[PDB]
Ligand binder design. Structure first.
Ligand SMILES: CN1CCN(CCCOc2cccc(CC(=O)Nc3nc(-c4c[nH]c5ncccc45)cs3)c2)CC1
Ligand SMILES: CN1CCN(CCCOc2cccc(CC(=O)Nc3nc(-c4c[nH]c5ncccc45)cs3)c2)CC1
Lengths: 389, 394
């Protein structure tokens, strides 16, 4: 019917997950105007007359919609290959956020889609939340909840982690990874840098740029290795054309590396050179050893070894319940179902909403001769006008 | 302002039918991008190829769901013009009858002149006047612009004038309606510039409505307009609009009043006051209106009608209507006991259409391959001058 067509079209515009929602449509127009406003293209009357018609409107839209100048940047609290994470305060609302910038220029010389989705729609206390996502001609912005407690790298460097704390943080990582796995993704880059603590000391996973959606069998088909030298599993490291098919058990190997790091003070496959670490991972059967220091319990050594094995015999091949039932998690202080309501080993002592005590002190595209469309791969990234409430 | 105020202003901008960024204009922007980019030569660019692949499924759905030409059953072609045709249509689903004007995008680019339809779309969509032909929907495809308007079953004034030797009482009625109709357009801030009987349509009751707003221009702060464009057939064009050839002079609403004088003369005399065998001859006679305007020596035209024709057919500076409509309205030619200006459209029209159905075309006379744009080697943006043309009434 006429009304059915009208209504199907209306739902396609409102839907927070639609490709033709208002956010995408405004992105589509903003991208057209960015890609066309160059003197060489303006020689074309179709382009020049179009830009002149939409001049006033594009300036209004740009002023009204979310932009970087809406945020007061307090401190740069993180860095990465394609940008930075900055502690911001939204000038108007006075609300405090962590804002991740991704260089459009650098990305050009697709990963952010799943990272945007996981953070925006997880609705999990274990996943860092995405409130807004916007963009300009130079960057992509992800306005997330600020994690004042810092990461696990910072914790590990300030404390000799006892087993009772290690048990807590491992248990939270396990629940956090199971939450991502249930959403249908493998993290593929589990490391203490990606484990953040909130104002109460409880964990949340961050950095979903390596996330990949599992198939019907719960596998991922990849030809290129992905992750970090120290925490990468043997099957992800050697992943190729012929082979390169793996599941959620690659994230469980990384939990074993993490537990070892916390209790031992070093990563299990540390070497003088990065290439030496690759060699030690591949030879985990002979290279995994424990120092002759009576501190690590029988149960902790067993968990580390149950995870730090070949995929086929790895703990977690039969799901989370076999991890959860491990003797290392046997304690009389918490239960799996209630864990995030318990009092954390380290409760952050914070002075303000912009306290950065857990955070250490920290070009673009040429002028196109012809239409290049550098803004086209980022159309629909905006999360503002059509958010899920 | 506040965060919520900014959020809400942006939201209302997306729903506003007067907005350049509402959903239909934004969907036009995307549909135009995909039309202009889907060529093998541009698809060599990964940004373009990946974008088109991502939006492939969506663009097909949107194209299928949105209003399109195949939604309309075309009954008869009832009009023709430089850039297309006016066809009597019935919307297949709703079963409602409309007149649909098609404007060729190929022709509008070939001949330049691809910006006239904006003021025509706005006037018809937003006039909300019994004197202005209404626009219900405006849509488009890679080749055409469509304007779905109210059908005017009574035909135009050219048809009437050709079937009757118009008496003064009818001429008074039709002139009075044209005057009220033009005043309505003027109040919206536009000068018509092409007032002619072809543009005066009659509805099912015999009352007038102006059509064809393709020459309309928005008046500035001082109520003036400036142009350089070609003047297609000069019989009704005023000396100012003709003197204004190539950015010469600024003129006001009094150019439409001159055309009313030409119209009144045509109705009572049977011929246009400045007719000539050639276009250039008509231009000469208009410019020399002081000596070329004459009346036939037959007492048929009243003192008052000759006075109105002459009050309008003079130089702008002394033209009736220089001090507004009230001086036109108060003219002795309009003095009658049959109607009042305020009530005129409620009176019984001189000629009431006798119609057999909702698709009766008795007042419409019965009525070549379509050239297409070549395959672009580089981005040309042929769909960009039509972004935002789409409009739907609620
Ligand atoms: C598969 N490919 C994808 C692209 N990959 C390039 C790295 C992406 O580039 C970044 C730019 C800036 C920062 C980062 C690190 C990062 O992801 N940081 C994050 N921080 C948070 C965060 C949320 N709330 C916070 N509160 C305090 C501190 C940090 C945060 C979420 S993700 C990466 C390489 C692997
Ligand atoms: C200098 N530039 C100015 C713009 N110029 C464009 C010519 C317009 O191209 C046409 C295409 C097809 C038809 C027409 C004539 C026309 O405007 N007819 C109209 N009919 C109606 C109409 C509404 N309801 C009706 N009911 C019955 C019959 C007709 C109608 C509205 S406009 C023009 C080119 C030169």
């Amino acid at each position: 019917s006429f009304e059915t067509r009208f209504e199907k079209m209306d739902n396609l515009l409102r839907d927070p997950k639609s490709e033709v929602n208002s956010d995408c449509l405004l992105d589509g127009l903003d991208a057209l105007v960015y890609d066309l406003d160059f003197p060489a293209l303006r020689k074309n009357k179709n382009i020049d007359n179009f830009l002149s018609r939409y001049k006033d409107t594009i300036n209004k839209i740009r002023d009204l919609r979310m932009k970087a100048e809406d945020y007061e940047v307090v401190k740069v609290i993180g860095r990465g290959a394609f940008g930075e994470v900055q502690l911001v305060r939204h000038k108007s609302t006075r609300k405090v956020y962590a804002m991740k910038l991704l260089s459009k220029f650098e990305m050009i010389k697709a990963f952010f889609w799943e990272e945007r989705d996981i953070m925006a729609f997880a609705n999990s206390p274990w996943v860092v939340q995405l409130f807004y996502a916007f963009q300009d001609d130079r960057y992509l912005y992800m306005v997330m909840e600020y994690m004042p407690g810092g990461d696990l790298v910072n914790l590990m460097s300030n404390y000799d982690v006892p087993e009772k704390w290690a048990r807590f943080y491992t248990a939270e990582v396990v629940l956090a990874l199971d939450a991502i796995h249930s959403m249908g993704f493998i993290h593929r880059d589990v490391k203490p840098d990606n484990m953040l603590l909130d104002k109460s000391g409880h964990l949340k996973l961050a950095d979903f740029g390596t996330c990949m959606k599992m198939n019907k069998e719960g596998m991922v088909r990849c030809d290129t290795a992905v992750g970090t030298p120290d925490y990468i599993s043997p099957e992800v490291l050697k992943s190729q054309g012929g082979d390169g098919y793996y599941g959620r058990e690659c994230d469980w190997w990384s939990v074993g590396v993490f537990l070892y790091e916390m209790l031992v003070g070093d990563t299990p496959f540390y070497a003088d050179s990065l290439v030496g670490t690759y060699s030690k991972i591949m030879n985990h059967k002979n290279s995994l050893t424990f120092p002759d220091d009576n501190d690590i319990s029988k149960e902790a050594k067993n968990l580390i070894c149950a995870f730090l094995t070949d995929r086929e015999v790895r703990l977690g091949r039969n799901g989370v319940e076999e991890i959860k039932r491990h003797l290392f998690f046997k304690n009389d202080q918490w239960a799996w179902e209630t864990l995030r309501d318990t009092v954390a080993p380290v409760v952050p002592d914070l002075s303000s909403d912009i306290d950065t005590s857990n955070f250490d002190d920290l070009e673009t595209f040429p002028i196109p001769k012809a239409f290049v469309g550098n803004q086209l791969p980022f159309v629909g990234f905006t999360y503002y006008s059509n958010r899920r409430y």
